[PDB]
Amino acid sequence: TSYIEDNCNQNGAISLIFSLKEEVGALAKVLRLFEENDVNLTHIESRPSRLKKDEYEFFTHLDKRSLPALTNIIKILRHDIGATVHELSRDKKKDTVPWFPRTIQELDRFANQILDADHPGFKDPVYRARRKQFADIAYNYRHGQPIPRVEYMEEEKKTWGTVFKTLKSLYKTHACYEYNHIFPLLEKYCGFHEDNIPQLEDVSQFLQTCTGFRLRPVAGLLSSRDFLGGLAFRVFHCTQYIRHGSKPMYTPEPDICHELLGHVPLFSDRSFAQFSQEIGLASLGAPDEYIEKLATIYWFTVEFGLCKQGDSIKAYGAGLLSSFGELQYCLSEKPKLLPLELEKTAIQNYTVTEFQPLYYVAESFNDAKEKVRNFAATIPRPFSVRYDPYTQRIEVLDNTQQLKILADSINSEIGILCSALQK
Amino acid sequence: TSYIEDNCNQNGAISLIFSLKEEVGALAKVLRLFEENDVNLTHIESRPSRLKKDEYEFFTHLDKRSLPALTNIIKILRHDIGATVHELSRDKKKDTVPWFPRTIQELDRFANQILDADHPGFKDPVYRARRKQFADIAYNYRHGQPIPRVEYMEEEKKTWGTVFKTLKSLYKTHACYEYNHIFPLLEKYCGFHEDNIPQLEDVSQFLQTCTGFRLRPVAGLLSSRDFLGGLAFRVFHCTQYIRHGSKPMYTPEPDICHELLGHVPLFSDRSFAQFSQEIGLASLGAPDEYIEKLATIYWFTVEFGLCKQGDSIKAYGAGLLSSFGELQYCLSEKPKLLPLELEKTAIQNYTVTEFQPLYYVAESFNDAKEKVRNFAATIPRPFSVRYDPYTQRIEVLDNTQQLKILADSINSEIGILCSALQK
Amino acid sequence: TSYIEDNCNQNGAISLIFSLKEEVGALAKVLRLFEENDVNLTHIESRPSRLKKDEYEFFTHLDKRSLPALTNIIKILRHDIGATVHELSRDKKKDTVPWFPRTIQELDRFANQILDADHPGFKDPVYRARRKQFADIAYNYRHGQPIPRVEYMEEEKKTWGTVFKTLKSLYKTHACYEYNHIFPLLEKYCGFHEDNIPQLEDVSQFLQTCTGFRLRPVAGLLSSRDFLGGLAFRVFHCTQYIRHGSKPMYTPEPDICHELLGHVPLFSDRSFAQFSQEIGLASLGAPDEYIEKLATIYWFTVEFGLCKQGDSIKAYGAGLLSSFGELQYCLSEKPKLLPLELEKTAIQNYTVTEFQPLYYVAESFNDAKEKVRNFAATIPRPFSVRYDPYTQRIEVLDNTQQLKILADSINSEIGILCSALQK
Amino acid sequence: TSYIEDNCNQNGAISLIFSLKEEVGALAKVLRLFEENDVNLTHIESRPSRLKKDEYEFFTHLDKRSLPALTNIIKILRHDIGATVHELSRDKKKDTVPWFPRTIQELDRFANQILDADHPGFKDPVYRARRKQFADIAYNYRHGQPIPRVEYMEEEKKTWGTVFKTLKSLYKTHACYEYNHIFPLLEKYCGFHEDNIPQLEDVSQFLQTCTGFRLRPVAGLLSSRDFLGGLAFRVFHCTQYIRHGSKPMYTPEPDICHELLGHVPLFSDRSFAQFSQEIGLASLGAPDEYIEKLATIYWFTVEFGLCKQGDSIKAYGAGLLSSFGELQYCLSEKPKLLPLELEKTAIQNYTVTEFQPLYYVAESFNDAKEKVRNFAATIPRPFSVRYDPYTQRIEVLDNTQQLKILADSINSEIGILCSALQK
Numbered sequence A, B, C, D: 001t002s003y004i005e006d007n008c009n010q011n012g013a014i015s016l017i018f019s020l021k022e023e024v025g026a027l028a029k030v031l032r033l034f035e036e037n038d039v040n041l042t043h044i045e046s047r048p049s050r051l052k053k054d055e056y057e058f059f060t061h062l063d064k065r066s067l068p069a070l071t072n073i074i075k076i077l078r079h080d081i082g083a084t085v086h087e088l089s090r091d092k093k094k095d096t097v098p099w100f101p102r103t104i105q106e107l108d109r110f111a112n113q114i115l116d117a118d119h120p121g122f123k124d125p126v127y128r129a130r131r132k133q134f135a136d137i138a139y140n141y142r143h144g145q146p147i148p149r150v151e152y153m154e155e156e157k158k159t160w161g162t163v164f165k166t167l168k169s170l171y172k173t174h175a176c177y178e179y180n181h182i183f184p185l186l187e188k189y190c191g192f193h194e195d196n197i198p199q200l201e202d203v204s205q206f207l208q209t210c211t212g213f214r215l216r217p218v219a220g221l222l223s224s225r226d227f228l229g230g231l232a233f234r235v236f237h238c239t240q241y242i243r244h245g246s247k248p249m250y251t252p253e254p255d256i257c258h259e260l261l262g263h264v265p266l267f268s269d270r271s272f273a274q275f276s277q278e279i280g281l282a283s284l285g286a287p288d289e290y291i292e293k294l295a296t297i298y299w300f301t302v303e304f305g306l307c308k309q310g311d312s313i314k315a316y317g318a319g320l321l322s323s324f325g326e327l328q329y330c331l332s333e334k335p336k337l338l339p340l341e342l343e344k345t346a347i348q349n350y351t352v353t354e355f356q357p358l359y360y361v362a363e364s365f366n367d368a369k370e371k372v373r374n375f376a377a378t379i380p381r382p383f384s385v386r387y388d389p390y391t392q393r394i395e396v397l398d399n400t401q402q403l404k405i406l407a408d409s410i411n412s413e414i415g416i417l418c419s420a421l422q423k
């Protein structure tokens, strides 16, 4: 499978999800309680609760180095004060919700936690000397920055040239509509020629010009939780390296072309973007088991999905649209095609290298979105999630908070629509 | 009054907002049209319709150098292709929608479109040179950049100190809760103390973490149209300069103390943000005729409003909470009180530097949002608008798409709600 | 005032509104509960939850013979099974919701709960015997039956003739359009001429073909509660008797002319029907406290209202359009005019037989519906209601179902709308 | 197939769908135009247009006997006045929309237009003498009446006894949930014992007590248009006859038991009722071709459908739940099961007698409702349809009328839901 079990750092990450009502002593109480225990107060951030006017939300920017007193604080918090605390832990210790980044800026803690001799071009010291350099670029990037741009060598340029020569000529009849729609634009705007390599930054900015989707330089393949969690933030982690000039149509681990020809152009569609994003949102705080299940879904859908299209069936898989041979295989009559169903799609085993025998076809991305949200209602976590586009932080919602926020949001949509009724 | 009519630049600003449905030649026709007539493509960016999968949307960043060629382009768009074209013009000539920005970045285009001997300290060279310094800072600032942090002199530090000493001790009973709650946060977080000035950047970061609202350093005062459009983007144009030490409770032009102590803390509540933003949206495409009325609203609502608050009447005006005398004058039997109703609230003359005879009271900011939106449904503009938080572009909507977009979005929201109903 | 407090019958009316979720024994438990304690099943009807597939809804048609046994049943329902029970009582004792009908057929239960020497014609035996005749007709009429058609004497025919002669010639400029349009229809269709009386049955048929509104022959005057509940069912309780020939423009108790010329023609517009019906629904479960206010509304709105109508102010009141003098008094500079706002419109004392000093003006009936519904959201009753047009039973809604039912219904409506958008 | 081509009567039915704006001369113009041409004015009914306050709708109760002048009237109507007229014709003559009943009362014109020697019990004069008697009962029924009740013979009673003995014992594990839910209620309420025959009227009234669904006595099998059109009105036409005592488990033409055990109990569920009803609504004014397609759908769904149910697949077909042998066959592993899709389901051929080889399974009835409405968007008719629950007439909607009615209806639902947001 494509599931990669997740890791941790020795310091770790112990966050405390809790909101607090402006009670007698409260905001003084908490921050003094922390600075008595040596906890830095650059790391105890509090902002208001966007729902109950009289409450705040608290973000604790910590690690396991605070353990000699982190017990005690929790002790006082849940039982001496009466604040509902959920602890995020990356070590996945005693019945502790699995850690995840909480703001779009917290992605830098565990973004470099990725990656055999048989790699194509292995005994070439040149390709490896280039590969550690590109990993370095991902090692030094911090959120907010523009992606540092690299002049690509030319042998790599014609590797892309060949792959593009094949795939372009073959997309017009193989790719989904939303791909033939975006791709001419990428060509004329970003530098998506068969004779030119685009820089990650420009593509990032274009995807933000279409959907607010962002490209983040990652050295390699991250653990499923981190990958799908970053996708929650409308952030796609992508690679900067190319395949070897010897074998331009096989890579065991995804390269520049897989993203630019498999993922990105569809990331320029809002319907598909939100589709992927909802899965992202659902991935966080989820059990490792359900992360295996998410990985399975992602594979048979994002990486290798098909879409019903009025008259045709077409491929929206990112591995489908990036691998010339399997893009031939896919619409051939060989493989299996059935209307997508997650009850089975999760319980669907697959292979990593071999051409995937069976495929699953959606109606439109939005129906798949509905289905994803449905399955999200199945993942067991003692709270809900929903993403804030402006603040770029994930609203962790409880019983009472889901209610007023959805209520009034739909009220505003209701108002604008009721005015749309008056022509 | 404080209403300011809008002006133009030598270059100008000619946009052609139009979308086009993907037929063979359509987008080819347009991109042919520009470079056939030599128009630069540094400014003609076309992206997909975030709504109709089969359409593109066109933002044309143009100017009056296209006047030597715009006739032909308009004609071919309106009649040879059949595209509904709305031309945005800042010259506001025959059949021209009054210009406004479509991108979060088009606010830098008209950020320098701003701004007397009786000022206390007019011939004081130090206050003059410092005001030219701050005008320079606002002159060269472009969106996305960090707000440069400025070292304040001591006279300015204690002028702020005095203003704060007076107003802070008073707020506990005059400001709305949404202020009495937020201010404890701002004090200890951004530096809203009596002996220290926060730098706009830090406050901006706080405000986007709360509401996606942003602080923009602006020279003097910008036309009503431009100010309120920037507020539509959840971007607040704000001042970095301080008042003179001679008269610490009189400033003719809004200053650091007025912005940080009158406006910001209320900009820290989402409900208030939605209120102001909905007004902003109503400003876009609006004629100067009803923009006089809009400025009036802002005055009597954001700057000089009162709000029903459970038991009492309280001040949420940014000018009430920034001018010490009128905050008491307003909470007395002296002034007159009228229930906010836009039939009258817009139609009401006023003066700027005056203890306001009458005030207007809201119920909660949300209902005020509703009233603003309702009255906005009355301004005649040949389309409505609503802002895309991720892309930071305002979806300009015609008849056909408004319904499909809100209908389906609410389809998703009500689905998740119907499933949440079963606990 | 014209407000009438409600009374009770010797039998009474004890309903227990409750639904129950289909577990083994649940519905078995209840049906066991009744016949274990001997209660008759001519009145205990259980039907499915039109909303939650897995639940039943229970309408229990009971009386005070169950007082010798209701204690046990209530207890077992509230604590041994765990069913949310709301008991409807017309005795309105401790912890009793004030009684109201759940079925379109429960209106016959309290249809005889109605009704002086100074009447012109009091000791006239002919008018007396005729009023006892019409009271008998209303006494034995049950819903569903055809309204018996009655042969009128000649004095009654020309009393009607005179009233009509006067008011008809005048309506062309005093009544709302929704009256000036409908009346041409009623004249030629039902027999609304100066020489002929329509029989309630024919008008009823007309009114259900327009609005589902129905004419019910009622003896004298029914308590405010009962009248307005019947109006909730889109059923109008109406009079079949005429006034005396002595005073053709004075009647203390509403008569055929008042109903057919004041009320009905406006009951022929759907928007007005929705207005009155929403009020009706608000009456259900309402305490007498706010029902005084409801009666006041009906008076100042349905019976004595004015409406903004594009350019002018016009009368849609049923008492304005039925009492010739006050229709002119009202359209003059004599009376006072106040914009309909329920904060004041409910809170306002009045007298019955009086040229009304002040009047209230609406914008359109639909907005008045909104205001009624809004103020209804203020009455404290332990559930909301909305009427099922096909079943002719009012869905009594608790928290959990309201959302799933309207959410999904609107899901369907917005789907068909989104598909209609493409022409 | 189960499609039966439709017939006509010699008089026929020429109706004219048109609305009219209150223009100079209008309402006098039309009715005088008709009475000049001998057209009875009991047959020219006009009521108001429920949308445009200034318009009426006109129903012409005619036949082909008006032909010697029906040309001329149409002549003046469409081209001399400018009223959009759509002619309904049952003969399906020159490009004339196929006739259908317009009110729930117009069903009596063509309700008796139904129905080989091999019928079971044919040479028994007793069964035929009974069969013409039951057809007579359907021949003499007119809308509004209660269904005349018959004392059933006893041999027929034990035919029902045997069929019930088998099917009841076999339903608890074969029938869909919504059947095991309703059926105990029918047992205890209507007289659904294995030892007793229910009278059509009581079942009708029960189905109206659940969903407003009604049972109308029909002599035999009607043409598809009339059957599905009656189902639009929430009216199910049903048979009063039984099978022969010789062979109680085979009938070529549906009998009492098929409805009471196949159709009715599901007609007591609102979700299923609306499901069937929307198809009904869609059937009217549809091409004969698409009536063949509708018949196909009805067969594979209503008569022989399955439903996905969380854990199981269960039968909701009316022939499935009425035929003991095929109810065994259905969940056996023999037949084919695929997720229902109307693109194919219509183009799905079948057999009349033989056990249907393949079956189609829905998720829940509502999803099938969505699908039906979707396919309805494909039937070609120059107007839309939507059913009025109160007036019990089908709103024929044009471009402009669909808009305001759906707009404001959803506005009301929006209001009630927005108030549900305030708890």
Ligand SMILES: C[C@H](O)[C@H](O)[C@H]1CNc2nc(N)[nH]c(=O)c2N1
Binding pocket: A002, A003, A004, A218, A220, A221, A222, A223, A224, A227, A228, A237, A238, A239, A254, A294, A295, A298, A299
């Ligand atoms: C989601 C699933 O685990 C899938 O294999 C992930 C794994 N990690 C990844 N890591 C990177 N860098 N890029 C990817 O596309 C993926 N895909």
Ligand SMILES: C[C@H](O)[C@H](O)[C@H]1CNc2nc(N)[nH]c(=O)c2N1
Binding pocket: B002, B003, B004, B114, B218, B219, B220, B221, B222, B223, B224, B225, B227, B228, B237, B254, B295, B298
């Ligand atoms: C909104 C209203 O027009 C008000 O007068 C505006 C005018 N332009 C402005 N310009 C600046 N720089 N600052 C302000 O506060 C205002 N206020």
Ligand SMILES: C[C@H](O)[C@H](O)[C@H]1CNc2nc(N)[nH]c(=O)c2N1
Binding pocket: C002, C003, C004, C114, C218, C219, C220, C221, C222, C223, C224, C225, C227, C228, C237, C254, C295, C298
């Ligand atoms: C609705 C208001 O309470 C008003 O006084 C009611 C009272 N009861 C009534 N009873 C009858 N029979 N007829 C009426 O018009 C009224 N009006």
Ligand SMILES: C[C@H](O)[C@H](O)[C@H]1CNc2nc(N)[nH]c(=O)c2N1
Binding pocket: D002, D003, D004, D218, D220, D221, D222, D223, D224, D227, D228, D237, D238, D239, D254, D294, D295, D298, D299
């Ligand atoms: C809808 C389809 O035509 C189906 O065979 C109809 C035909 N006519 C009918 N006629 C009657 N009386 N009852 C039915 O169930 C049907 N079914």
